[PDB]
Amino acid sequence: NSVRDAYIAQPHNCVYECARNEYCNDLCTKNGAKSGYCQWVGKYGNGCWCIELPDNVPIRVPGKCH
């Protein structure tokens, strides 16, 4: 779809680690998301999770972070 909830990604297919929830909310919203938070446990471990991220922004997908 046009929006999805997921780990925002940086080059190349890598999550953004986090220490604070606010860091993720800022990172996510700055990229068009509704909000975001720091996931200390989840599918790929520690990383920022965004709610309703636009699809022109990369998300973590199956594969290797490189």
Domain encompassing residue 33: 1-66
Question: Which residue, among 40, 13, 1, has the nearest Cα to 49 in the 3D structure?
Answer: 40
* Close Cβ partners of 66 (under 8 Å, ≥ 6 residues apart): 12, 13, 14
- The CATH number covering residue 45 comes to 3.30.30.10
Residue 38 DSSP SS3: strand
- Give the resolution in Å: 1.9
Pairing of strands 14-15, 47-54: unpaired
Tell me the backbone φ, ψ of residue 28, rounded to 5 degrees: -65, -50
Instruction: Specify the number of domains making up the chain.
Output: 1
